[PDB]
A and B are shown apart, each in its own frame.
Chain A
Amino acid sequence: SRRYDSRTTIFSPEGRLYQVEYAMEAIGHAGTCLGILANDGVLLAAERRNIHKLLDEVFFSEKIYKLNEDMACSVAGITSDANVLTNELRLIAQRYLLQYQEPIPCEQLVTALCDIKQAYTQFGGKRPFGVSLLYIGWDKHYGFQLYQSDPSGNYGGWKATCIGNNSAAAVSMLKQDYKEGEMTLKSALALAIKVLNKTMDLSAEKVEIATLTRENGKTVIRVLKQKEVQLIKKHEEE
């Protein structure tokens, strides 16, 4: 029925996609999430929106998802939509490995998912996914990498970026502090705490940090324990 159809996949008179823009509004109200590239690894730092005292915490992470052996990601927006998309990312990665018997290069994984998101903006008359994702990974082509995708299916590579709440304020701090080509993981960690310190309105229970490194020709993805997240104490001295 033409009466009830909200027409989610049309252009506005200015050549805008309203559903995409309203989806990006949703993301701006989601937990802060940032990623930083260094010379010896990549990291993701996320604000936990959980926060409640009576929560159980059954998983190893809440906002950081492993995608394959060499890749993880984090999300900002509708949680349920993120679950659909991250499942799909795992499927694409496995489909590539089946076919080529090598891991999917990071950009190829991002492009494949963005094609799905783009499709939702052009046909099918459905609402788009209200998710921005940060992807971290290593491949044999470009080494350590960081990507960001948004609801329209646009993506870009970054040395450092932020999505979610107060991301504009975060991107400002990154431009000032990020030493291009001179960042280690230890200094990147420091900068992450420093950025989350300003944008978040800090506790170890309120943040989640994952690092991606190479050890003996093999990728290691680990979520830092509460004790390691010592990093908050190291900043307050500065």
Chain B
Amino acid sequence: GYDLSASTFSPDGRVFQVEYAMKAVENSSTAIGIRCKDGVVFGVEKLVLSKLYEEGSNKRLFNVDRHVGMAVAGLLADARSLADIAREEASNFRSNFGYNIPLKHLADRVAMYVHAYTLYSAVRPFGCSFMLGSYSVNDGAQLYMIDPSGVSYGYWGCAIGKARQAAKTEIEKLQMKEMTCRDIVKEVAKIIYIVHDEVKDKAFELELSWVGELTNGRHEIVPKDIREEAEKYAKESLK
């Protein structure tokens, strides 16, 4: 009975409420981020739960600043509120300091907010993990990932959700450092099609966004035509 409150340690020094929130992420479908030569690309396996939904419903890719994208897995309502926290943090930074928030600083700030929800019986931990991606000439490409505990690290490649371990195996095969975003979108599409459990979950939409030199440091959705080319490449690669 040591697992009811985030203000309670178990006898072996664990905080089970945080671990239980992480399980909610593990039950979500997979999102991946890959940092390449000149930017960052995001892809999401977005499960189609109903044919009644519009194509574009329940986006899991967000702009949190003009230069910052965010990819989420877990409880989507919690993720949306974290997107708002991040947006407010980027907004406030510009007001105070007079320039665009560095990605590392934004990650740190939002992570400390996430962490604050792991200490108290008064609130519960966020049931979401997310990736932040950015590009500028001065800072280059950066990709960070934050989990429900509030841990924040930078990555060359990252995956969150139920097929995370399987996604990483595929990502490790890439020499992403040498590749352009154009090549990476195809690889991201590919990896999502590989880790997709076709037997268990039917129907998914592929969601793609990027930020890099090619977008002039602006986080944008991957154009439809490029997205379709990536889908066709991923489909034919899978045989």
CB neighbours of A3 from chain B (8 A): 4
- A1-B121 Cα distance, complex, nearest whole Å: 7
Contact with A along B85-125 (1 / 0, CB 8 A): 00000000000000000000000000000000000010000
CB neighbours of A1 from chain B (8 A): 5, 121
CB neighbours of B4 from chain A (8 A): 3
- A1-B124 Cα distance, complex, nearest whole Å: 13
Which residues of chain B from 1 to 22 have a CB within 8 Å of any chain A CB?
Answer: 4-5
- A3-B1 Cα distance, complex, nearest whole Å: 12
The B interface, classified by DSSP as helix, strand, loop or mixed, is: loop
CB neighbours of B121 from chain A (8 A): 1
> Shortest distance in angstroms between B1's beta carbon and chain A's nearest beta carbon?
10
- A3-B121 Cα distance, complex, nearest whole Å: 10
Kindly report which residue of chain A lies nearest to residue B7, judged by CB atoms: A1
- A181-B4 Cα distance, complex, nearest whole Å: 66
Interface residue count on the A side (C-beta < 8 Å): 2
Kindly report which residue of chain B lies nearest to residue A1, judged by CB atoms: B121
Which residues of chain A from 1 to 37 have a CB within 8 Å of any chain B CB?
Answer: 1, 3
- A1-B4 Cα distance, complex, nearest whole Å: 11
Chain B residues touching A, range: under 10
Contact with A along B119-140 (1 / 0, CB 8 A): 0010000000000000000000
- A91-B192 Cα distance, complex, nearest whole Å: 75
- A1-B123 Cα distance, complex, nearest whole Å: 11
- A3-B5 Cα distance, complex, nearest whole Å: 11
> Shortest distance in angstroms between A5's beta carbon and chain B's nearest beta carbon?
12
> Shortest distance in angstroms between B124's beta carbon and chain A's nearest beta carbon?
13
Which residues of chain B from 41 to 84 have a CB within 8 Å of any chain A CB?
Answer: none
- A1-B5 Cα distance, complex, nearest whole Å: 10
Kindly report which residue of chain A lies nearest to residue B122, judged by CB atoms: A1
Which residues of chain B from 126 to 168 have a CB within 8 Å of any chain A CB?
Answer: none
> Shortest distance in angstroms between B63's beta carbon and chain A's nearest beta carbon?
39
Kindly report which residue of chain A lies nearest to residue B121, judged by CB atoms: A1
- A3-B3 Cα distance, complex, nearest whole Å: 13
Kindly report which residue of chain B lies nearest to residue A4, judged by CB atoms: B121
> Shortest distance in angstroms between A4's beta carbon and chain B's nearest beta carbon?
8
> Shortest distance in angstroms between A16's beta carbon and chain B's nearest beta carbon?
30
Kindly report which residue of chain A lies nearest to residue B120, judged by CB atoms: A1
- A2-B4 Cα distance, complex, nearest whole Å: 12
> Shortest distance in angstroms between B208's beta carbon and chain A's nearest beta carbon?
45
> Shortest distance in angstroms between B122's beta carbon and chain A's nearest beta carbon?
8
CB neighbours of B5 from chain A (8 A): 1
- A3-B122 Cα distance, complex, nearest whole Å: 12
- A3-B2 Cα distance, complex, nearest whole Å: 13
Kindly report which residue of chain B lies nearest to residue A3, judged by CB atoms: B4
> Shortest distance in angstroms between A1's beta carbon and chain B's nearest beta carbon?
5
Contact with B along A50-79 (1 / 0, CB 8 A): 000000000000000000000000000000
> Shortest distance in angstroms between B4's beta carbon and chain A's nearest beta carbon?
8
> Shortest distance in angstroms between B7's beta carbon and chain A's nearest beta carbon?
9
- A63-B98 Cα distance, complex, nearest whole Å: 67
- A193-B121 Cα distance, complex, nearest whole Å: 57
> Shortest distance in angstroms between B167's beta carbon and chain A's nearest beta carbon?
39
> Shortest distance in angstroms between B121's beta carbon and chain A's nearest beta carbon?
5
- A3-B4 Cα distance, complex, nearest whole Å: 10
Contact with B along A89-103 (1 / 0, CB 8 A): 000000000000000
> Shortest distance in angstroms between B172's beta carbon and chain A's nearest beta carbon?
45
- A21-B121 Cα distance, complex, nearest whole Å: 32
Contact with B along A170-206 (1 / 0, CB 8 A): 0000000000000000000000000000000000000
- A231-B5 Cα distance, complex, nearest whole Å: 64
- A1-B8 Cα distance, complex, nearest whole Å: 13
> Shortest distance in angstroms between B8's beta carbon and chain A's nearest beta carbon?
10
- A1-B7 Cα distance, complex, nearest whole Å: 11
- List 3 interface pairs A-B (beta carbons < 8 Å), by A numbering: A1-B5, A1-B121, A3-B4
Chain A interface residues toward B at CB < 8 A: 1, 3
Chain B interface residues toward A at CB < 8 A: 4-5, 121
Across the A-B interface, the 3 shortest Cβ-Cβ residue pairs: A1-B121, A1-B5, A3-B4
